[PDB]
Amino acid sequence: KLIESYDKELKEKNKKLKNTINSDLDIPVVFFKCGHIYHQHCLNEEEDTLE
């Protein structure tokens, strides 16, 4: 039962993640996961300051 659930769950999650990635202040960048977003090419990436 666990394997049967896990296979379907993994397939659905992979499909959803692929669709979300294909769906998408639009330059390629990783937004902060606590309420922030900025363009990496706008010098936001690698700001140093020991992160």
Binding site: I3, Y6, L10, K13, K16, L17, T20, D24, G35
Partner: protein
């Protein structure tokens, strides 16, 4: 050329007695069937075979002559046993077939060589006919432990556990039972860990989707 070999090939009473004597022993890790045959031959004929073996040694590349010799040996079979003397390691000269003779009396090495996923419970049932007080149990335990990785099917494992002896001490099978239980628990734990990791990945994907929803 080959005419002399045919004459040499042209040129089974104590074999049964030797086979019975070998079958009398019931040791789990005794001498191999080929080893037992070699020991019996040393105790003992093979000189003519050795003369043929000298030609056979010179026939390391004569495939047609090898096939002809195998056919002659099949036609000159003695109790379907003496061919093993002519083919100590040439079983493919002329696998699902050696168990008729190799597994007939006793051969642990041949049993491992011809082991497989199927035809396993039958071998255990046949070996269970030793009827020894404890030597049979010891041999069964040794056979199970030697190829413990062969059994990997739930139905096969249940069938094997069903046909366990009902008059044996629990100490002998305690190690096997503990190993089986530990393997089952480890498999269940691994499946649970994989499911938890998949759930965590799904939660991460859901969090990304929620962040995207927050992003406009």
């Amino acid at each position: 050329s080959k005419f002399l070999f045919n004459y040499y090939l042209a040129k089974w009473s104590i074999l049964g007695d030797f086979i019975k004597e070998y079958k009398d022993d019931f040791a789990y890790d005794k001498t191999d069937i080929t080893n037992f045959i070699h020991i019996k031959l040393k105790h003992s004929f093979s000189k003519y075979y050795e003369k043929c073996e000298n030609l056979k040694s010179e026939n390391e590349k004569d495939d047609e002559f090898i096939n002809f010799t195998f056919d002659e040996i099949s036609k000159i079979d003695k109790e379907h046993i003496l061919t093993l003397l002519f083919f100590p390691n040439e079983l493919t000269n002329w696998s699902e077939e050696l168990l008729k003779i190799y597994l007939s009396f006793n051969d642990f090495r041949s049993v491992e060589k011809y082991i497989g996923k199927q035809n396993l419970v039958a071998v255990m049932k046949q070996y269970l006919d030793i009827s020894s007080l404890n030597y049979s149990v010891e041999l069964v335990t040794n056979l199970l432990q030697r190829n413990f990785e062969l059994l990997d099917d739930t139905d096969i494992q249940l069938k094997i556990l069903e046909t366990i002896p009902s008059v044996f001490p629990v100490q002998t099978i305690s190690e096997l039972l503990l190993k089986v239980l530990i393997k089952y628990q480890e498999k269940k734990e691994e499946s649970n860990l994989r499911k938890c990791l998949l759930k965590n990945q799904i939660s991460i994907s859901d969090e990304l989707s929620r962040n995207f929803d927050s992003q406009g």
